């Protein structure tokens, strides 16, 4: 099998910034990887296209995936509103880790974050399911619009997304 590769084209107040592509570890977390892949192609009728990164904290991570409320309180999986913590085999070892945001054990929906640093304190609590394959420089450019409190100075959106491989 081959792990899926997904992309996001990021825009900053509608201006295109660039493409970030992600390898999803379907061989290790199939259900979590499948959820993010299907939400990136929009094939169930809902997904990430047009949604924003609502909380970016420089040196920590960029968070997005709330396509229903756009503020951290909504979004849902392709399995129903929430699904279980599949496993915690993988850790938040450094910049580029793609991991699920949540509100406690077994509350995975659509929200995710992209780590810009090693965040070992989230190991065992947030399921790591992918990594940035190309476009880490686009993630870095994105951090310049966040703040310590997480609010962005510009609206950072996923102008388009889908699967490459």
């Amino acid at each position: 099998m081959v792990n899926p590769t997904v992309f996001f084209d990021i825009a900053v107040d509608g201006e295109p910034l660039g493409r970030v592509s992600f390898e999803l570890f379907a061989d290790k977390v199939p259900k979590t990887a499948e959820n993010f892949r299907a939400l990136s192609t929009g094939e169930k009728g809902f997904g990430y296209k047009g949604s924003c990164f609502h909380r970016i904290i420089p040196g920590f991570m960029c968070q997005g995936g709330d396509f229903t409320r756009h503020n951290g309180t909504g979004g849902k999986s392709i399995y129903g509103e929430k699904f279980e913590d599949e496993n915690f085999i993988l850790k938040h070892t450094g910049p580029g880790i793609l991991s699920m945001a949540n509100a406690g054990p077994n509350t995975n929906g659509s929200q995710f974050f992209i780590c810009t640093a090693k965040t070992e304190w989230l190991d065992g609590k947030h399921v790591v399911f992918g990594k940035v394959k190309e476009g880490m420089n686009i993630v870095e450019a994105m951090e310049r619009f966040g703040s310590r409190n997480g609010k962005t100075s510009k609206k950072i959106t996923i102008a388009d997304c889908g699967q490459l491989e």
């Binding site: 991570m61 968070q63 509100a103 974050f113 989230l122 947030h126």
Partner: peptide, 11 residues
């Protein structure tokens, strides 16, 4: 603190 939650963002 530095968490990534959905709904109540904690310190």
């Amino acid at each position: 603190x530095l968490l990534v939650t959905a709904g109540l963002v904690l310190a």
